[PDB]
Amino acid sequence: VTGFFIAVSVIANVVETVPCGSSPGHIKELRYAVAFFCLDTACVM
Amino acid sequence: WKGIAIALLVILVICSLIVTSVILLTPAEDNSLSQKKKVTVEDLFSEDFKI
SS (H, E, C) chain A: CHHHHHHHHHHHHHHCCCCCCCCCCCCCCCCCCCCHHHHHHHHHC
Contacts of B15 in chain A (CB under 8 A): 1, 5
Closest C-alpha among B23, B13, B10 to residue A36: B23
* Longest Cα separation, chain B: 85
Method in brief: cryo-EM
Restricting to B residues 1-51, those with a Cβ less than 8 Å away from any Cβ of A are 8, 11-12, 15, 19, 22-23, 26-27, 31
Contact A42 B19 (CB under 8 A): yes
Interface with chain A: mutation pick from B6, B22, B34, highest number of A CBs within 10 Å? B22
Q: How far is CA B39 from CA B45, B47, B49, in A?
A: 12, 15, 12
